[PDB]
């Protein structure tokens, strides 16, 4: 060991300046006279991840680890090989690697700031904590330093010793500040203000300080929206009305434009409890500001006087109708939802009396509008053929508008008329080809209509279009969920649509002379290839969001160091926020329910199709076999075709790259060993450590560990579930039923489990469900359940279906009661149910 | 309705799902995240509010209303809509406004630069853009002291031309030949911004006659005169 | 300003154009005569009129600088003019008319013709009431619809100083 490390040492500022190829000649070089070298195997893996390499890479990094037996070694080696790690969202292995280095001697206290970013992704504070002040105390001449020490304080719970520090640190250094850092200084104070928050309380003192403070530091704060913001809630917490008040006329003059304002407002006054107050203020507030909505909104929400109500409803909608905008009934959108036979009436009153006055050819405009604003109410109403009608009096009056297509479009669809309404809507997007709402919403509703190719040609038109025949790679490029998850479900209906085709095609069973059905095969079994092959395309999409989720987690790298260079703490604190809420997005939990879905469905299937029926020889023959007919030049031609059909069309759906997932066909994933520990150590972990108390599915958490032997979970959850929403809902009385179907000796499971599920529920409810009625099989749970919960619920009884095979309840009675309960609601609902659900 | 706001991270990626339905040139969750993170006391959001409206009460009274399920029972979550950010609010629209940062060579002073102004086009034509730059416009102007203001617009969008040229009132600096990813031509265009015309309450009236009475906000005046209950100018 | 306001149609809305032949007078017109007007030898001149911000009056004209092979018709050939029947009574036509011999007048010429249906008399009238003058009669043969049917055609011409 003598020439090796001079070579590395010399080939080290090739890596350390912008050099690739020259470094790894020379690491080759070194390896062909040693292959033994640690430190070269190290560089070697590195520097062929960052190029495109990846097996490769990780093959050399692989040997370099196991080419260590202690930890005694240079620290560059270490270094490379915590680089490496943070490149490949390795976070504890780079933070061990750089402990070990920093433990054995380096001279680079830059390298502990490293750890302070690495920590600060796994949430690890107690060392942070003392790793942000080493990285402090070894540099003294930046304010990032100060920044990142505040915070580490701030969060852990050092609120007195961050105080302290930000006071010595305006006292050393108060009026050396140049201008560019007065905004950033501004922030800071902010932050301190922040601090000085969590020092508030409920103090009389203490609150009197902070305002104090806040006062003082006011002429130096640039930030005038969040410091008024905070002294309106100082003065809301110590009892001055008339300052809060003029601070949030202030905020009001800086921004009428908002609902916050005025709730704080109405709260501050306390003159919520009398009307005629509020009716003034609004009046008098009215007068300053004509041009804005809020302040003629709100007032629609504590008039009791029905003249009053309707004079203050047409003094709202005539200057909406005069000017036309394209959202009157978005203006009266919340107000549906909690009004209706006492506003609705009236509303409709006055705009039939304000048309009955109008002009097709004086007024077109409001014409045309009115026409519009009766379309949605009606809508709204459940009514279908009078809406029609008006749409399409609106379109012969003027049919240059995208809004009466979309409308006309939305009839269609809650009519069960998909395909009717993407026509139309394709036909009044080809008016003019600018817009990108109208294109996603045609893609939407196409994909809606079990029209897949041609929304994906409809799609490719404004993406980038490069290495590819479409826009599905720009598409994934540009962080897309919408389309993935309507997508998937067109591809979900048409795969479940073919048991259904299978089932009547089966049905036959070649009755007789029924030749038809056996003399065509191929386009049926070519159709049915196609259909698998776009169900396990749907799968490995829906093994994109949880990926852009991670992705988007672990690219919060640089972030922590740029947060604390610019100077931007309550940033920090709002990514950290983000970065913890991200698990709770309602499209997230979408897509996971129906991930479980399908895994489950998988697990079933493969559970059921493993031992049954016989004679496996006489079914595993499958075709490429024409007995004396040349069967393995045909089947040699099969293949063929069937590869250069393939080719083209994962060339057609091409989306990942070749070089970084292999798994294109998705022939893998439907075919997995394990799905439920995939499915817990992938999609349910980061669900169960990142998720609050009210807002937690817990039919998901039910569905998941029913099928894993704990019954302990499914009972917390029922329990906290019936302390929540109530325990008059159906899917409390299903799930109950389910649970004691479970418990039943029959099923293969764990005695102790079912017995101490049995001895809780005997605990806990014991005058609501019958407990001791397991061992008689003519007690019906259906009649039960209708005479308690009833059978007007839709989704106790879409669970009951659901899990009908372990819960023997019947079948055709409980789908004729779903037939009959579902009538009460919308037709393309009742349609979906009756063609997939039932 | 309409409610102007600032521009949250909890949002941001309904933020990019609005970009989806607006202009084409789409963006990372870098580039937002790095815009939302770096000046957040520039970009602004416009969603709606949902609030009380005689609950329960006896007037026609009706426990079978819908309000996103939260009259009674029905549970209580949030419907699966990504446009949606909370029981009762979504976002219509944003303005993305960040600083000049990158080197110059030249000593340029601390300017405003608009992004990107992406409004839903079912919810225009009734001030929401222009409110939002305005207040952008006044926060920069109050806080980071911006001289001036520059931005690019099109050609075809009459309603940007109307926005900006017309409405704002904006001065074009230049023109720049094939700017965008489809080669369409752009004008760039560029205003000096001052104190003391960039303020809210002197733009309370959209138009007027000849000559009003341009009432505005002074001292204290609601917390004045009586009780609304008995005196003279009760009703 | 004024709530009738014109616009050049550009291509992007070349598909909205096509709609209005079909709000107008159907069987007239195809899909290849307007898609062939922004394929890239004659020359095109298209208008939409906007009345408050929607789109109401279409004009889409062809100049033919052809005088050798021609007895006397030379200048703006007025093709297509939509007018809805619920926007009218306005001075929309009279605007687009006045548009027409704007453009006419700039193009170096000094007369716009214009063919008219046989079967109609409102129109012939309205169009008369302008200022036009009709050439003889009646052209045997002349107008071609979509399934096949044949009627006579008119011409109004008028010279612009």
């Known amino acids: 060991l003598k020439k090796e490390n001079d070579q590395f040492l010399e080939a080290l500022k090739l890596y350390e300046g912008k050099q690739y190829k020259k470094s790894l000649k020379l690491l080759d070089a070194i390896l062909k006279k040693d292959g033994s070298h640690v430190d070269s195997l190290a560089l070697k893996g590195l520097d062929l991840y960052s190029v495109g390499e990846k097996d490769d890479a990780a093959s050399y990094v692989a040997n370099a680890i196991r080419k260590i037996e202690g930890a005694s070694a240079s620290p560059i080696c270490c270094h490379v090989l915590g680089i490496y790690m943070r490149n490949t969202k390795e976070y504890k292995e780079s933070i061990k690697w750089f402990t070990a280095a920093l433990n054995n001697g380096s001279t680079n206290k830059q390298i502990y700031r490293d750890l302070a970013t690495l920590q600060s992704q796994i949430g690890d504070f107690k060392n942070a904590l003392v790793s942000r002040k080493k990285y402090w105390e070894a540099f003294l001449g930046y304010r990032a330093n100060w920044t990142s020490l505040a915070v580490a304080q701030d969060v852990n719970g050092e609120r007195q010793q961050a105080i302290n520090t930000l006071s010595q640190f305006e006292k050393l250094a108060e009026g050396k500040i140049s201008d560019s850092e007065k905004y950033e200084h501004s922030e800071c104070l902010m932050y301190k203000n922040d601090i000085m928050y969590k020092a508030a309380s409920d103090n009389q003192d203490k609150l009197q300080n902070v305002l104090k403070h806040l006062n003082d530091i006011e002429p130096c704060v640039f930030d005038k929206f969040g410091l008024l913001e905070r002294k309106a809630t100082i003065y809301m917490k110590l009892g001055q009305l008339k300052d809060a008040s003029i601070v949030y006329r202030t905020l009001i003059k800086r921004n009428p434009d908002n609902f916050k304002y005025y709730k704080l407002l109405e709260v501050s006054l306390g003159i919520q409890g009398d009307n005629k107050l509020k009716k003034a203020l609004y009046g008098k507030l009215e007068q300053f500001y004509p041009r804005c909505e809020p302040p003629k909104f709100i007032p629609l929400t504590f008039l009791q006087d029905k003249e009053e109500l309707s004079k203050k409803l047409r003094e709202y909608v005539l200057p909406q109708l005069e000017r036309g905008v394209p959202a009157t009934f978005s203006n009266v959108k919340p107000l549906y939802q909690r009004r209706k036979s006492k506003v609705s009436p009236l509303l409709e009153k006055i705009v039939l009396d304000y048309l009955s006055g109008l002009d097709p050819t004086q007024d077109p405009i409001p014409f045309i509008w009115t026409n519009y604003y009766l379309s949605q109410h009606f809508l709204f109403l459940k009514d279908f053929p009078k809406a029609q009608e008006y749409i399409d009096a609106a379109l012969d009056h003027t049919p240059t508008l995208v809004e009466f297509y979309i409308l006309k479009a939305r009839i269609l669809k809650h009519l069960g008329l998909m395909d009717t309404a993407a026509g139309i809507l394709e036909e009044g997007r080809q008016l003019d080809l600018q817009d990108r709402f109208i294109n996603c919403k045609t893609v939407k509703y196409f994909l809606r209509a079990n029209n897949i190719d041609k929304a994906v040609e409809v799609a490719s038109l404004f993406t980038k279009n490069d290495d590819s025949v479409n826009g599905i790679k720009d598409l994934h490029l540009v962080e897309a969920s919408w389309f993935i998850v309507e997508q998937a479900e067109a591809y979900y209906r048409l795969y479940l649509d073919r048991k259904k085709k299978l089932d009547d095609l089966a049905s036959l069973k070649k009755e007789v002379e029924s030749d038809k059905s056996e003399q065509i095969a191929n386009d049926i079994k070519e159709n049915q290839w196609l259909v698998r092959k776009y169900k396990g395309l749907a799968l490995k999409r829906f093994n994109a969001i949880p990926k852009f989720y991670k992705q988007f987690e672990d690219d919060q790298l640089d972030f922590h160091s740029y947060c604390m260079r610019k100077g931007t703490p309550r940033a920090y604190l709002e990514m950290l926020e983000w970065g913890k809420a991200l698990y709770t997005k309602p499209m997230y939990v979408r897509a996971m329910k129906e991930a479980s879905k399908l895994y489950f469905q998988m697990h079933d299937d493969r559970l059921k199709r493993k031992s049954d029926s016989l004679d496996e020889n006489s079914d595993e023959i499958q075709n490429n076999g024409q007995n004396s007919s040349s069967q393995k030049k045909k089947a040699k031609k099969e293949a063929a075709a069937m590869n250069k059909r393939k080719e083209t069309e994962a060339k057609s759906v091409a989306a990942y790259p070749s070089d970084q997932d292999n798994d294109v066909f998705g022939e893998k994933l439907i075919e997995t060993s394990t799905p439920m520990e995939d499915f817990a150590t992938e999609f349910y972990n980061n669900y169960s450590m990142q998720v609050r108390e009210d807002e937690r599915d817990y039919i998901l958490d039910f569905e998941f560990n029913y099928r894993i032997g704990k019954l302990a979970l499914c009972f917390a959850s029922l329990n906290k579930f019936a302390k929540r929403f109530g325990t008059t809902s159906g899917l409390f009385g299903s799930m109950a039923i389910v649970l004691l179907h479970a418990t039943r000796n029959d099923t293969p499971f764990d005695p102790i489990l079912k017995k101490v599920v049995t001895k809780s529920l005997e605990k806990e409810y014991s005058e609501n469900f019958p407990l001791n009625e397991i061992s008689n099989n003519s007690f019906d749970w259906l009649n039960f359940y209708q005479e308690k919960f009833g059978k007007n619920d839709i989704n106790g009884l879409l669970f009951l279906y659901r899990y009908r095979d372990d819960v023997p309840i019947g079948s055709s009675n409980l789908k004729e009661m779903i037939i009959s309960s579902l009538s009460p609601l919308e037709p393309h609902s009742q349609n979906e149910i009756l063609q997939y659900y039932l | 309705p309409i409610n102007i706001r600032r521009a949250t991270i909890n949002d941001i990626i309904c933020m990019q799902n609005a970009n989806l339905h607006n202009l084409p040139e789409n963006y990372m969750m870098k580039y937002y995240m790095y815009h939302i993170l770096s000046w957040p006391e520039a970009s602004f959001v416009a969603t709606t509010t949902t609030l009380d409206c005689e609950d329960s009460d006896e007037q026609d009274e009706n426990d079978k209303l819908e309000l996103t399920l939260d009259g009674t029972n029905d549970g209580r979550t949030i419907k699966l809509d990504p446009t949606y950010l909370a029981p009762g609010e979504k976002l219509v629209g944003y303005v993305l406004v960040k600083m000049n940062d990158d080197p110059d060579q030249q000593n340029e002073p601390p300017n405003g630069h608009i992004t990107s102004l992406s409004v839903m086009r079912t919810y225009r034509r009734m001030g929401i853009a222009e409110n939002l730059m305005r207040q952008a416009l006044f926060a920069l102007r109050e806080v980071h002291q911006a001289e001036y203001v520059s931005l690019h617009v099109r050609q075809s969008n009459r309603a940007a031309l109307h926005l900006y040229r017309d409405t704002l009132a904006f001065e074009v600096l230049s023109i720049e030949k094939s700017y965008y990813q489809d080669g369409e031509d752009a004008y760039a265009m560029k205003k000096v911004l001052k104190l003391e015309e960039l303020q809210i309450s002197n733009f309370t009236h959209r138009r007027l006659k000849e000559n009003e009475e341009k009432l505005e906000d002074d001292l204290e005046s609601d917390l004045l005169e009586d009780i609304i209950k008995q005196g003279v100018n009760d009703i | ?161």
């Open chain 3, 1 to 161: 300003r004024d709530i009738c306001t014109l616009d050049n149609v550009y291509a992007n809305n070349l598909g909205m154009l096509t709609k209005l032949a079909h709000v107008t007078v159907p069987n007239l017109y195809q899909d290849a005569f307007f898609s062939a007007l922004f394929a890239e030898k004659d020359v095109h001149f298209t208008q939409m009129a906007y009345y408050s911000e929607i789109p109401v009056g279409g004009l889409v004209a062809k100049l033919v600088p052809k005088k050798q092979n021609e007895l006397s018709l030379k200048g703006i050939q007025i093709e297509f003019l939509g007018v809805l029947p619920n926007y009218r009574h306005k001075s929309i036509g009279s605007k687009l008319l006045k548009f027409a011999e704007d453009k006419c007048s700039e193009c170096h010429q000094h007369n716009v013709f214009v063919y008219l249906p046989a079967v109609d008399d409102l129109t012939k009238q309205w169009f008369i009431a302008h200022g036009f003058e009709q050439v003889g009669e009646t052209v045997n043969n002349f107008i071609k619809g979509v399934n096949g049917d044949e009627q006579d055609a008119i011409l109004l011409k008028k010279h612009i100083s």
